[PDB]
């Protein structure tokens, strides 16, 4: 249960006369903020999304982000003109931090272009990604001439961000520690082959995300369990399906076991009987 603060930006530049920047902020697995291009401010998704920041501190960050958005779009379009990059361009920003209790804090600011890392903020300066195109080196040089932006980003990453994470953890402690019980059910699946069965175990509605689901005979875990991806529900719960390829005779006495924090040490066990 680690709760990193991830601020994500998705900027698309097509037609040179069409661009959009969208953003969101995640605390762990919960989306805490949304930033749409047609709105002037970042929108809070939770009653505790402001953390322990005062009203003025949050509005200060809002002004910072409006300037950041307009300046980023203009700087990217100027970069496209100075070098030979063809539109459309797909820039992504992943920035944020993680707080160790009482010891240290760490942060990151990674930029991707067409899905590939191109540069990052290290220490006090911009550094290009390993095996980066040659023109990115010219971009680093211009960015490193701007000491005010480097100072502001360093202030945000090393000072503002850890306090924001701490405030969000304290203020939204009730929702982060929330426990929602999953409901599970068994099913049949497309036959793998002749004389065989695909046992399916659905588990849906659990929060938080960590979960354990396996097919098994009593206490022995069937090492052939095929866990799928943990997929999101609209109400911020999760869904997971677990399957097992089995001889029809072996399906007798087999059960699906679910371990989740909401269960208070007990497990949900579903036996193959219907």
């Amino acid at each position: 249960r680690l709760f990193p603060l991830r601020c994500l930006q998705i900027s698309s530049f097509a037609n040179s006369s069409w661009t959009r920047t969208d953003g969101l902020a995640w605390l762990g697995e919960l989306q805490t903020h949304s930033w749409s291009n047609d709105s002037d401010t970042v929108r809070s998704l939770k009653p505790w999304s402001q953390g322990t920041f005062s009203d003025q501190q949050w509005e200060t960050l809002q002004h910072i982000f409006r300037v950041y958005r307009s300046s980023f779009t203009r700087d990217v379009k100027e970069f496209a003109k100075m070098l030979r990059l063809s539109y459309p361009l797909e820039l992504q920003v992943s920035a944020g931090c993680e707080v160790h209790p009482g010891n240290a804090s760490n942060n990151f600011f990674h930029v991707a272009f067409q899905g590939k890392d191109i540069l990052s903020f290290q220490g006090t300066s911009w550094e290009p990604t390993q095996e980066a195109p040659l023109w990115v080196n010219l971009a680093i040089q211009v960015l490193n001439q701007d000491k005010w932006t480097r100072e502001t980003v360093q202030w945000l990453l090393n000072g503002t961000c850890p306090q924001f994470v701490s405030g969000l953890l304290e203020s939204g402690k009730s929702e982060l520690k929330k426990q929602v019980k999953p409901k599970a059910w068994l099913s049949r699946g497309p036959s793998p082959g002749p004389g065989r069965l695909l046992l399916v175990c659905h588990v849906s509605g659990f929060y938080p995300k960590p979960v354990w689901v396996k097919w098994m005979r009593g206490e022995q875990e069937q090492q052939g369990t095929q866990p799928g991806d943990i997929l999101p529900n609209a109400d911020e719960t999760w869904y997971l399906r677990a399957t097992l390829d089995v001889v029809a005779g072996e399906a007798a006495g087999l059960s699906c076991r679910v371990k989740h924090s909401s269960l208070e040490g007990q497990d949900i066990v579903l036996y193959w009987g219907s």
Partner: T-cell receptor
Amino acid sequence: QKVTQAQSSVSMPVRKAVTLNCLYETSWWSYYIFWYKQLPSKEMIFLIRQGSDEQNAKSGRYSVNFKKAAKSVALTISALQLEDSAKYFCALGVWGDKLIFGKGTRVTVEP
Amino acid sequence: SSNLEGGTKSVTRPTRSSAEITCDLTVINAFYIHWYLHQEGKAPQRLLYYDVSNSKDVLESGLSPGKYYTHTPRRWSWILILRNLIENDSGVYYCATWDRLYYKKLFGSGTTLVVTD
């Protein structure tokens, strides 16, 4: 092969670093010391492992201070949370066999 | 609710009878199932262990044979049976095992045995 935890009950405020003492008397060349946590509902939970071969180990907020000559394994918990209040146990054993436990030390995190 | 099983449990039995203690632990490839007893104010100690592959019980020295029996009602499921229950048998009984690479020893939820006549 004996394990002793001299401290019985220890109290400490939040966000501090508490230390539990453990002294073992063994003759094995190779062995392991485990630190477990016991909950009010009587549930054992593995916290840390420190064998006689490696250096001092840590995992998250749990660290271990190891001295072979004086036979000391001191557990250190950093930045205590309100859920840390529990009974911590020190155990000594070799792989695939029994564990020799101490009587445990109760740690109470005060607000 | 009707499909929940495991977790912390208690078994209350009179003296001079037998007690069954369940194991909610989960294994990948377990050759042995250890049984530990924890009494209030005392260090947890292992009483015996069960050889699963060969279905045997090995008791710690000083324990009378037949007092403890590990039973396999269903495949890969284990229950500890205590005979001739005395007041001193009260305490929390855990089932435990080493993981696949013998890194750590996992313990079960535990069952509080209360022996009162």
